[PDB]
Amino acid sequence: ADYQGKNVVIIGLGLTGLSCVDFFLARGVTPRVMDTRMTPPGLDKLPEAVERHTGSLNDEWLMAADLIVASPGIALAHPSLSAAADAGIEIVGDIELFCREAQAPIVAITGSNGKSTVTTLVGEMAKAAGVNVGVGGNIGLPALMLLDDECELYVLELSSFQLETTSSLQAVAATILNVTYPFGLQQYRAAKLRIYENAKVCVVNADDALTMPIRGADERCVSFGVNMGDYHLNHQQGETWLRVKGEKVLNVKEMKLSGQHNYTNALAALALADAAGLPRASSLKALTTFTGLPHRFEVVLEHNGVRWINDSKATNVGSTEAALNGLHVDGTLHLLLGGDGKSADFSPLARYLNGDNVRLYCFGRDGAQLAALRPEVAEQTETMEQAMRLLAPRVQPGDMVLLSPACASLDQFKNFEQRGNEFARLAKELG
Ligand code: NI
């Protein structure tokens, strides 16, 4: 598309906004930028020629724009943007700008959880095939930074926020992994359903009806699931295989990923790669080489028959449910739950907490809430380190120590990554 002579305003000076700045500069267009923060750190990176307004949105600039490029996020709800729409001013996001300029097929992935694992893994399948692939979007580099005439395939992770502002995506294959929001619930689902519009192939979760396109399944749909679907899992005394269209394709022992959820992520990835035309042999190869992302049901230690699992990326009840459903534990599960639950209903976790082989170690702001799930088997401490010092002397060969806390880490940590890193350090110290 041609932006010459347009009055362009970018909202947001994070890396995504800066990518949009670079995008217009490269096309001879000097956009205006604004950010509600007083000193966003992107400031220091702007060219001198770019007019900037910070500390709030500038209504006059928005109302004078020919195009508003909105960084994705709660900012999309700001009443000044809504006023700009009412005046007929075009509003788009970086993903729309990208789709207009992309000169290679797009694989598009959204979902409440599993999206980064799946996006990365489809990336690795393309790399295994020798395909010049650009991987990013809502994870890694923002999408505009991936644009390159040499690119043969793009694999994008997309948020609901990004999809709200995207009208030009025609993915070669797209998925909603699952659906577990500023604009309300219907809006959240509706936004994800945008990903299927003009997608050649839709990869749906057989286990989550909300991932099905609006009007139902259609001829474009390929499913992945635990017990059934085009891509599913098959389990026979001691062994689990990925199964595709009726055929086992890989024993999971050949994969580095562990856990039912990552296996379904592997299936969804395979299905997207198969739909994108990637060769099957190299995509299987990638399944055997891919280590997994840190903090995503990641095995950080396995000594003396005890596996220590960092699932710190589980910051909500849906993520933890996904970690708990189909969990395989020979001996006792030692489950660490805690942090800032953000007023969540934890009860869905309770289904998974019966039997004689579960111990709970609860901590952080809402530790009390979490222990109340089954007080009989719960301890409560202030910190995860304290909880880990309680369980460590109790573990026995056969056990699993799982950090899947169902809460945000911000009461005690900088982010879920620091929480997982500390968990790994302590596991190594104690285990
Ligand atoms: Ni050892």
Author numbering: 1 to 180, 187 to 437
Can you quote the paper on this entry?
MurD catalyzes the addition of D-glutamic acid to UDP-MurNAc-L-Ala, generating the dipeptide moiety L-Ala-D-Glu in almost all bacterial species.
We achieved this by solving two intermediate conformations of MurD which we named Intermediate Free MurD (i.e., intermediate conformation of ligand-free MurD) and Intermediate Bound MurD (i.e., intermediate conformation of MurD with ligands). In the solving of Intermediate Free MurD, 421 residues were refined. There is one minor region missing between residues Thr180─Tyr187 since it could not be traced in the electron density map. Superposition to open unbound MurD structure revealed that the new structure was clearly in a distinct conformation. There is a difference in the orientation of Arg302 as well as its interactions, when compared to the previously solved closed conformations of MurD and additionally orientation of Arg302 in Intermediate Free MurD is different from all of the orientations found in the aforementioned structures of MurD, which contributes towards the intermediate conformation adopted by the protein. This suggests that it is not substrate recognition which causes MurD closure, as previously suggested, but that domain movement is an inherent feature of the enzyme that is independent of ligand binding.
